[PDB]
Design an enzyme around this catalytic site. Structure first.
Site, mmCIF file in Angstrom:
data_model
loop_
_atom_site.group_PDB
_atom_site.id
_atom_site.type_symbol
_atom_site.label_atom_id
_atom_site.label_comp_id
_atom_site.label_asym_id
_atom_site.label_seq_id
_atom_site.Cartn_x
_atom_site.Cartn_y
_atom_site.Cartn_z
ATOM 1 N N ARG A 26 63.164 65.855 -11.406
ATOM 2 C CA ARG A 26 63.777 66.356 -12.631
ATOM 3 C C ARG A 26 63.034 65.661 -13.759
ATOM 4 N NH1 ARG A 26 69.863 64.508 -14.013
ATOM 5 N NH2 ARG A 26 68.760 62.601 -14.636
ATOM 6 N N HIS A 67 82.979 60.378 -23.526
ATOM 7 C CA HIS A 67 82.876 60.746 -22.101
ATOM 8 C C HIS A 67 83.476 59.637 -21.232
ATOM 9 C CE1 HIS A 67 80.660 62.717 -18.634
ATOM 10 N NE2 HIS A 67 80.750 61.489 -18.112
ATOM 11 N N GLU A 68 83.061 58.353 -21.464
ATOM 12 C CA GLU A 68 83.556 57.247 -20.635
ATOM 13 C C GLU A 68 85.050 56.961 -20.816
ATOM 14 O OE1 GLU A 68 81.698 56.649 -18.161
ATOM 15 O OE2 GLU A 68 79.794 57.333 -19.006
ATOM 16 N N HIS A 89 87.019 59.525 -18.927
ATOM 17 C CA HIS A 89 87.055 59.314 -17.468
ATOM 18 C C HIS A 89 88.359 58.583 -17.025
ATOM 19 C CE1 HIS A 89 83.657 61.060 -15.609
ATOM 20 N NE2 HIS A 89 82.713 60.273 -16.101
ATOM 21 N N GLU A 100 83.504 65.327 -14.429
ATOM 22 C CA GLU A 100 82.453 65.219 -15.437
ATOM 23 C C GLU A 100 82.571 66.225 -16.550
ATOM 24 O OE1 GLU A 100 80.723 62.631 -15.615
ATOM 25 O OE2 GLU A 100 81.261 61.877 -13.621
ATOM 26 N N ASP A 156 82.954 65.467 -20.401
ATOM 27 C CA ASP A 156 82.016 66.008 -21.393
ATOM 28 C C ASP A 156 82.767 66.735 -22.511
ATOM 29 O OD1 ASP A 156 79.660 65.152 -20.004
ATOM 30 O OD2 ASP A 156 79.265 67.156 -19.152
ATOM 31 N N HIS A 164 77.898 65.725 -11.721
ATOM 32 C CA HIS A 164 77.641 66.259 -13.068
ATOM 33 C C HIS A 164 77.133 67.654 -12.936
ATOM 34 C CE1 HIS A 164 76.918 61.934 -13.277
ATOM 35 N NE2 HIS A 164 77.688 62.035 -14.351
ATOM 36 N N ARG A 199 75.930 71.576 -19.045
ATOM 37 C CA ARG A 199 76.767 70.585 -19.725
ATOM 38 C C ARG A 199 76.744 70.950 -21.219
ATOM 39 N NH1 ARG A 199 75.482 64.555 -17.445
ATOM 40 N NH2 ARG A 199 77.552 64.132 -18.317
HETATM 41 C C1 LIG Z 1 77.843 57.076 -14.593
HETATM 42 C C2 LIG Z 1 77.605 58.336 -15.498
HETATM 43 C C3 LIG Z 1 76.970 57.942 -16.860
HETATM 44 C C4 LIG Z 1 76.634 59.125 -17.798
HETATM 45 C C5 LIG Z 1 76.422 58.626 -19.251
HETATM 46 C C6 LIG Z 1 76.302 59.893 -20.138
HETATM 47 C C7 LIG Z 1 77.446 60.671 -20.386
HETATM 48 C C8 LIG Z 1 77.330 61.878 -21.093
HETATM 49 C C9 LIG Z 1 76.111 62.267 -21.660
HETATM 50 C C10 LIG Z 1 75.991 63.538 -22.426
HETATM 51 C C11 LIG Z 1 75.227 63.599 -23.628
HETATM 52 C C12 LIG Z 1 75.083 64.832 -24.308
HETATM 53 C C13 LIG Z 1 75.633 66.013 -23.744
HETATM 54 C C14 LIG Z 1 76.397 65.954 -22.565
HETATM 55 C C15 LIG Z 1 76.577 64.704 -21.906
HETATM 56 C C16 LIG Z 1 74.954 61.499 -21.408
HETATM 57 C C17 LIG Z 1 75.049 60.318 -20.642
HETATM 58 N N1 LIG Z 1 75.375 59.657 -17.227
HETATM 59 C C18 LIG Z 1 75.209 60.987 -16.992
HETATM 60 O O1 LIG Z 1 76.041 61.804 -17.376
HETATM 61 C C19 LIG Z 1 73.895 61.468 -16.357
HETATM 62 C C20 LIG Z 1 73.079 60.352 -15.658
HETATM 63 C C21 LIG Z 1 72.108 60.791 -14.563
HETATM 64 O O2 LIG Z 1 71.733 61.959 -14.457
HETATM 65 O O3 LIG Z 1 71.719 59.795 -13.718
HETATM 66 C C22 LIG Z 1 78.959 58.951 -15.741
HETATM 67 O O4 LIG Z 1 79.836 58.375 -16.326
HETATM 68 O O5 LIG Z 1 79.159 60.190 -15.299
HETATM 69 ZN ZN LIG Z 2 80.868 60.874 -16.278
#
Ligand SMILES: C[C@H](C[C@@H](Cc1ccc(-c2ccccc2)cc1)NC(=O)CCC(=O)O)C(=O)O
Ligand SMILES: [Zn+2]
Ligand SMILES: *[C@@H]1O[C@H](CO)[C@@H](O[C@@H]2O[C@H](CO)[C@@H](O)[C@H](O)[C@H]2NC(C)=O)[C@H](O)[C@H]1NC(C)=O
Ligand SMILES: *[C@@H]1O[C@H](CO)[C@@H](O)[C@H](O)[C@H]1NC(C)=O
Ligand SMILES: *[C@@H]1O[C@H](CO)[C@@H](O)[C@H](O)[C@H]1NC(C)=O
Ligand SMILES: *[C@@H]1O[C@H](CO)[C@@H](O)[C@H](O)[C@H]1NC(C)=O
Length: 696
Positions: free
Chosen positions: A49, A530-531, A534, A593, A597, A658, A664
């Site tokens: 990817r 996002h976190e 969760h 996820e 999001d 995800h 997304r």
């Molecule tokens: C542990 C994991 C962390 C998460 C952090 C994250 C969260 C959301 C977005 C994002 C930004 C703009 C649009 C939509 C979403 C970007 C980064 N990492 C991933 O999502 C992909 C990582 C990979 O592919 O290894 C989680 O909490 O799920």
């Molecule tokens: Zn997540």
């Protein structure tokens, strides 16, 4: 009123270069935000990817190479050990000179690999029990075969550790691959050919005779055994409810309920548990509480394991370990994995040795490498700016609660209590930089030889497994970081009710104190959202403020959550991915996820509107005829400019929780009325459907 700073020009150039301004934003915002990147880029031969996000990780590896590759007089012992580990990893001439010898020397300690052994039955059969064979791979090497026994946090008692029993992982990415037809045929063929290629190399090195039809027969049998194991495992869809998955029992209860007969011997759960737990001097009785995550699997295993001999089982168990070690041996062994890697990832070669090595040392010495990383690449002063952003997003989430009509007052109050109790971890633990001795003491037991890479990785396996097992009788450390700092990701821990933002993610396009706030909120603000979300998704919501698996929802609030969330199951389940051969996303497995999001996007945009209210409009970006509400969405979408190799799309559609980046982006913005107003989207245009899914 245009910003003309160096930082604004760099943000503007990046945003301009990635986008395709000839695409209508309301027709396909992913193509509008990322079309320029898509036209200009090709996936590297070593990437499964590639995109803006993967580039950030490739760039972090560059930093790791710079900080590990050169010794310095000031280096503390912990750093000296990380650099010596790195040097042993990158020395391909020493590795090539050892051939397969380090593996041959290891083989007797795992009861050998029957196919690559002459008179196996005579040599090991006398001292072979499933209890001992499964436990040996587990306790000494962290390799979990047939039965996955581990020490981890008690879901219902976050402060303690408990033994868990679960179904093990497979050699192939998911249970779906074991169908071995259509899109899975090439991978199944490459997998068995890989087993045969390795058996052939081991037999050739040991100077043993080779009967090609017998290698084919034996390894095809390993595949038939594993296909039965794969079919016995529970699908991810049936493991998404942590309440249903959690089944606490005593070893006595497990022996009654989940008995097994292997090689004509009745399986002793107590013997197996002690064969593992003795490694760190802990005795176990039938009074020991055990969390069983896979009771259905252990039941289906009973008729499968009676049909195979000690030989057939050890052929699989040893292969499952050997599979992972072949990349740490000479070029001849490394080559044997080529078709298998191409079938699962689509990559035509392995990633640069230094990159694999920087990542390996980061994974095993996260605190030493985290220290080196933050000194070279992280501001630290920026930790305070992110701390404020977190407070703004946590506040928005708490405010949003009262505007939810589908949740009752009592469940709203309890959700607020959990949201208030979330502990944040930003950048790095101060101790890795300020306490050299604590860091040296962490790696006390590690002694690496610069010319013995395989021995170093073996030592790491034993150290990692001994550390996790000795945790059983210990209390969960509250201070402990769930991730190293040199990581481009962020995390939520349900057991600690904590959000973690490593230094690795606190950089452009996510965050910069020097970039527009529209970009910061659309980037890291969204990640923060996002976190936090969760803690309240289909999994996280089953956990309380202290991290315990306890129902704090009323029946009507839970029912209304499931109903609201069912929209997203259908929305994402209906996306069809061309790269994955037209297959539908798994709307159930990606739900957690997608809720996160969708929740995160809402919270970050509202926190950004609150910012504009308090501080007024920001200066515009040059060369971009967009306002800051539009730039917020543009940055948000550009996080996922990228693409996948079709082999990897087939893999990730089954293994990734995800949704793929493009979905997304499409999925979240389709559910956003705020997006449609910013880009003036006509009703029922692709980006603006009538039905919008909402949960947080
Ligand atoms: C542990 C994991 C962390 C998460 C952090 C994250 C969260 C959301 C977005 C994002 C930004 C703009 C649009 C939509 C979403 C970007 C980064 N990492 C991933 O999502 C992909 C990582 C990979 O592919 O290894 C989680 O909490 O799920
Ligand atoms: Zn997540
Ligand atoms: C695609 O979306 C449709 C529409 O929301 C989903 O259809 C629903 O499916 C369930 C289960 O089959 C039915 O009980 C509903 O009556 C259907 N609703 C409608 C309006 O048709 C469909 O499930 C989604 N597909 C996937 C793979 O998620
Ligand atoms: C690699 O290892 C060999 C054998 O120990 C040694 O001769 C050589 O100098 C090493 N190379 C580097 C660059 O350390
Ligand atoms: C898969 O498992 C089910 C349930 O145990 C069983 O009935 C079925 O025969 C198995 N199918 C295959 C292809 O092994
Ligand atoms: C497990 O059982 C074997 C015999 O089946 C025995 O030799 C061994 O000592 C037992 N281990 C423990 C720790 O009980």
């Amino acid at each position: 009123g245009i910003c003309k700073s160096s930082d604004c020009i760099k943000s503007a150039a990046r945003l301009i270069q990635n986008m395709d301004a000839t695409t209508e934003p309301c027709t396909d915002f992913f193509k509008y935000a990322c079309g320029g990147w898509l036209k200009r880029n090709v996936i590297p031969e070593t990437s499964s990817r590639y995109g803006n996000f993967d580039i950030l990780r490739d760039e972090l590896e560059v930093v790791l190479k710079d900080v590990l590759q050169e010794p310095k007089t000031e280096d503390i012992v912990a750093v000296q050990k990380a650099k010596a580990l790195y040097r042993s990893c990158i020395n391909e001439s020493a590795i090539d000179s050892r051939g397969g010898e380090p593996l041959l020397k290891l083989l007797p300690d795992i009861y050998g690999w029957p196919v690559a052994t002459e008179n196996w039955e005579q040599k090991y059969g006398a001292s072979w029990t499933a209890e001992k064979a499964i436990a040996q791979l587990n306790s000494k090497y962290g390799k979990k075969v047939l039965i996955n026994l581990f020490v981890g946090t008690d879901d219902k008692n976050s402060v303690n550790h408990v033994i868990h029993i679960d179904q093990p992982r497979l050699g192939l990415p998911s249970r779906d691959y074991y169908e071995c037809t259509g899109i899975y045929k090439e991978a199944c063929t490459a997998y068995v050919d890989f087993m045969i290629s390795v058996a052939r190399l081991i037999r050739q090195e040991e100077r043993l005779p080779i009967d090609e039809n017998q290698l084919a027969l034996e390894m095809n049998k390993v595949m038939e055994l594993e296909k039965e194991i794969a079919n016995a495992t529970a699908k991810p869809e049936d493991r998404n409810d942590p309440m249903l998955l959690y089944n606490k029992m005593t070893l006595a209860q497990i022996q009654n309920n989940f008995s097994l007969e292997i090689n004509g011997k009745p399986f002793s759960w107590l013997n197996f548990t002690n064969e593992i737990m003795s490694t760190v001097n802990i005795s176990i009785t039938n009074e020991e509480d055990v969390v069983v995550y896979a009771p259905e699997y252990l039941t289906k295993l009973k008729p499968i394991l009676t049909k195979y001999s000690a030989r057939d089982l050890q052929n699989l168990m040893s292969w499952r370990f050997i599979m992972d070690l072949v990349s740490s041996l000479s070029r001849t062994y490394k080559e044997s994995r080529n078709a298998f890697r191409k079938a699962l990832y689509g990559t035509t070669s392995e990633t640069a040795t230094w990159r694999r090595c920087a990542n390996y040392v980061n994974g095993n010495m996260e605190n030493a490498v985290g220290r080196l990383y933050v000194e070279a690449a992280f501001a630290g002063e920026s930790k305070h700016v992110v701390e404020d952003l977190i407070a703004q997003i946590r506040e928005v989430f708490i405010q949003t609660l009262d505007d939810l009509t589908w949740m009752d007052a009592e469940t709203k109050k309890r959700a607020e209590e959990k949201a208030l109790a979330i502990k944040e971890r930003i950048g790095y633990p101060d101790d890795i930089v300020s306490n050299d001795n604590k860091l040296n003491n962490e790696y006390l037991e590690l002694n690496y030889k610069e010319d013995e890479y395989f021995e170093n990785i073996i030592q790491n396996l034993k150290f990692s497994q001994s550390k996790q097992l000795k945790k059983l009788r210990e209390k969960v450390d509250k201070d402990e970081w769930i991730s190293g700092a040199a990581v481009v990701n962020a995390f939520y821990s349900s057991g600690r009710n904590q959000i973690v933002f490593p230094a690795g993610i606190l950089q452009p396009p996510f965050f910069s104190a020097q970039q527009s706030n529209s970009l910061n909120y659309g980037g890291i603000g969204m990640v923060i959202g996002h976190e936090i979300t969760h803690g309240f998704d289909d999994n996280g919501r089953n956990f309380n403020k202290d991290g315990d698996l306890v129902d704090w929802w009323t029946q009507q609030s839970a029912s209304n959550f499931k109903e609201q969330s069912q929209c997203m199951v259908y929305q994402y389940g209906n996306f069809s991915w061309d790269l994955a051969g037209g297959q539908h996303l798994n709307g159930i497995n990606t739900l957690g996820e997608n809720i996160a999001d969708n929740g995160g996007l809402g919270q970050a945009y509202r926190a950004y509107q609150n910012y504009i209210k308090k501080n007024g409009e920001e200066k515009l970006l040059p060369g971009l005829d967009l306002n800051h509400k539009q730039l917020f969405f543009l940055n948000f979408a550009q996080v996922w400019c990228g693409t996948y190799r079709p082999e990897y799309a087939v893999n990730s559609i089954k293994t990734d929780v995800h949704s793929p980046g493009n979905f997304r982006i499409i999925g979240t913005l389709q559910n956003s009325a705020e997006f449609s107003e910013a880009f003036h989207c006509r009703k029922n245009s692709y980006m603006n459907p009538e039905k919008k899914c909402r949960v947080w």
